[model samples]
Structure formats: structure tokens, C-alpha cells
Target: ADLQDAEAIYNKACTVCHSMGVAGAPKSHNTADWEPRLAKGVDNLVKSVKTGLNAMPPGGMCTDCTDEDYKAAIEFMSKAK
Candidate 1:
């Protein structure tokens, strides 16, 4: 259920763009975009997701999500094939 939990966050927030790479938002599971971001480390990415950067709204617009939710979402999305 952990993966699904992460997916839920994505569905609720990230799906708006990430699912389709809208507005240059990285496509979910895309190695080219995810790899470099992942290399910076999960913690760093989590902070950015929570704080928002450029066009990505803070907390990813998920007012109900906790830090753990963001961490799990990042983990699920950043995994490579």
C-alpha cells in the first residue's frame, strides 16, 4: 500500500502536470528528468516539493499531506528501471 499511498499524492496533486509533463513538469517515471533530480538526494527533492520552485506550487497544493507523504511520493516517483 506504500506505493499506492505515494501514488495517491501524485493523483491528487502532481497528476495535474507530472503525468503529462505539462508546463515542463517532469513526467512521472521519466529517467531523464527524474535521474538528475534524484541525484541531488531525496531530502533535497522533498524540500523543493514542499517549498515549491518556479512553477511547482508549494506543498504541491496538497494541504493535507505531511512530510512523510512527500517523502514517500518522491521515493516512488524517483525509482529507476
Candidate 2:
């Protein structure tokens, strides 16, 4: 997948906590940190984001985002470099 939209979504919505791994949010771009969650499948990841996982709020604060949006953001954040 082209990551332009993923990058945009991450910068705008996920960067706040994920960038620094705040509140245990799994640091962005860190495969080690994200591997466990990734193992749970992207759909499961989406579920957590939708329902709020730990410190993350429902919809991950992206009030207007769709499931595809969340999937892109997750892929963007979890990919190995």
C-alpha cells in the first residue's frame, strides 16, 4: 500500500502518544514494540483502537476516521524500517 495517507493520518492523529510511546502506546516505527500487537492481527488492532485500549481513547481521538484510516495508521506505525 502507498503510505502517503498512512503517514498523514499518523502525523495528524497518532503521533501525539505513539511518537513517544506515551501511556504505553507502543512507539511508532518500532517493530519490537509493535510485534506483539501485530501478532494479534490488524483487525484486532482496529478493534482496540475503536473501543479504546488502555490509555488510548475511543476512535483514537480521530473522531472522523474510518476503519481503513485506522488500518493505514496502524500499518504506518508498526512497519519495520
Candidate 3:
């Protein structure tokens, strides 16, 4: 799906883990935390969200998210802090 409300999606779902860095999840806008995860590039990062990491479930909590939506959300979080 071509996601439109990435912010809403992030706020509704991603925040659950991202806000407090629960279970090793990176806290939102933490550049020092996101840096290593981002080293693989946005595309690869999106792939991870699509595929899911150890504690991270698929779709990054947004089951209906799109490739672009994930990118937008990631960029939004990065710029947020």
C-alpha cells in the first residue's frame, strides 16, 4: 500500500516500542541509536521493517504500511529529535 499518513501510523504503533527504547528498540530521534541501524541504508532498513528483526515484528507495527510510508516515518523520527 502507498501509505499517506506515516506520522499517524508511527504515532499509533511505532511509539509503543520506539518512544522508550523497549526491548532494545531504538528510541525515536536518537541519532546515536539509529546510526548503526541506518548504516544499511533506508532501503535495507525498510526491508528489515518488512521482514522484522528479533524483537521487532513485521511491518514495524503498521501491518498495512508501504515501502514509502516506512521511509517517511523513519525520516520523521530522525528529524523529530
Candidate 4:
């Protein structure tokens, strides 16, 4: 499982806002919140996360994360709902 990497990415990059939907991050497990973003297409979201969006910093603060790592994290959070 990529749970460890997922958790690490979440802790390092997502938890800050995702845990509470801060800055409209869609919360950690809110299907309703995530639905729209997910609908935008995973690839698009991945690109945004890689670059940065609004309040979210580039690479989601995970300067060492690869595109695959970001994808894993996205999958992890998206399914949490």
C-alpha cells in the first residue's frame, strides 16, 4: 500500500487546510466538497497541485514530492470521503 506515502504527503501538505477545509480545500473527507474538484479531472487537479492554486503553495509544500506522489496523495484524499 502507498498508505505511508499518502499519510506523509497529507500530513506535510494537505492537513493544514484539508483537515478543516480551510481556504476551501474541500476538507479531508467531504465527498460533496471534493466532487466538483474531482469532476474537473484528476489530471487537472494534479497539475494544479504540482504548481499551486490560490492559497495552496506550489508542490503543495512538498518540494521533494514527485508527480506520482502527488497523484497518490490526491487519490488518498479524494477517497477519504
Candidate 5:
């Protein structure tokens, strides 16, 4: 799991809104929410972590994360826990 100690990263950053779907982050494991994003492609989605997207700033406060790590986090959040 590239979730960056999923619980750690979630608490450190993601849980702020992702868990609640705040800022339209598409709640964790929300199939309807993830469907569209995933359809666009995983690489495209992962790229956003490095550059930021919507209300979120670049790196999502995880500059210590790699592309692989980001992918792991993405999958974890985009799926049912």
C-alpha cells in the first residue's frame, strides 16, 4: 500500500475533506465519484498530486511522497475501506 502509512497521511492531510467529500473530493470509495476520475486515467489523476488540483495545493502537503506513493493513496481512498 502506497498510502504513506494511509492512516498517517489520511490524518495528516486527506481526512480533512476527502472522508467527508468536502470541496468535492468525492468521498473515499465513492464509486460514482471515482468513476469519472478513474475514467480519465490513473496517470492523469496521480499527476494532480504533484501539481495540485481544484482547491487543493500542489503536493497535497506530501512532498515526501513519490508517484507510487500517491497512486497507493489514491487507490485506497477511491475504494471501499
Candidate 6:
């Protein structure tokens, strides 16, 4: 239920900006844009999302998200299409 959950969560929350890279939010399935962020590793990425990084709100605006959910979502977004 990792990436599967991420897909649903992506559609529900991340799609707002990630779908089109709005407000510097990395576009989904675009490895290039997500490279640097990925290098920071999943844990750091999760922390960023949890605390609200840049324009993104805390918990990625998803109250249901857990740390694992954030990791999966990050991988889901950073992967090549």
C-alpha cells in the first residue's frame, strides 16, 4: 500500500502543483526536477513536507499522510515516466 496509496494521495493533494510544477513544486514523473531533492534522501524529504517547505503546507496538506506515505509519494514523483 505504499505507492498505491501514494497515487491516490498524489491525485488528492500533490496534483495541485506537482502536476504542472506550479510555485516551484516539482512536476510528477520528472526525474530531472526532483534529482536534487531526492539526493537529500527520503527522510529529509519527509521532514520537509511535514514542516512545510517553501509554498507547500505542513503534512503536504494531507492529514492522513504518514512518514512512509511521504516517502512513497516522493519516490512516486521523482521516478522517470
Model 1 global lDDT (CA atoms, 0 to 1): 0.71
- TM for candidate 4 is 0.78
Q: Estimate candidate 3's alpha-carbon lDDT, on a 0 to 1 scale.
A: 0.71
> Candidate 2: worst 10 consecutive residues by lDDT?
72-81
Clashes of 4: 0
Candidate 4 wrongly placed segments (more than 4 Å): 1-4, 79-81
Q: What is the number of residue pairs that collide in model 1?
A: 0
Model 6: lDDT of residue 15: 82
Off by over 4 Å in 6: 1-4, 79-81
The model with the greatest TM-score is 1
lDDT by residue (tens digit), candidate 6, 20-77:
8788766687667667766755576677777887798877777756756667776766
What would the per-residue lDDT of candidate 1 be over residues 1-81, giving only the tens digit for each residue?
233487787776778888887887777877777677657566877777778878988766766677677777766777421
Cα lDDT tens digits, model 5, 4-35, are 47556666777777777787676766777777
TM-score of each: 0.80, 0.77, 0.78, 0.78, 0.76, 0.77
Alpha carbon lDDT at 64, candidate 1: 65
Winner on lDDT between 2 and 4 is 4
lDDT for residue 16 in candidate 3, whole number 0-100: 76
Which 10-residue window in model 6 sums to the lowest lDDT?
72-81
Q: Say which prediction, candidate 1 or candidate 3, comes out ahead on TM-score.
A: 1
lDDT of 2 by residue, 1-81 (tens): 223486787887777887887776677777677677657566877777778876877767767677676787777666321
Clashes of 6: 0
Spell out the clash pairs found in candidate 4. Answer: none
In candidate 6, position 55 carries an lDDT of: 93
Poorest 10 consecutive residues by lDDT, candidate 4: 1-10
lDDT of 4 by residue, 1-81 (tens): 133587777776688888877776677777777787766577777777778888987767777676667777878777322
Superposed by TM-score, candidate 3 places the C-alpha of residue 67 at a distance from the truth, in angstroms, of: 1.5
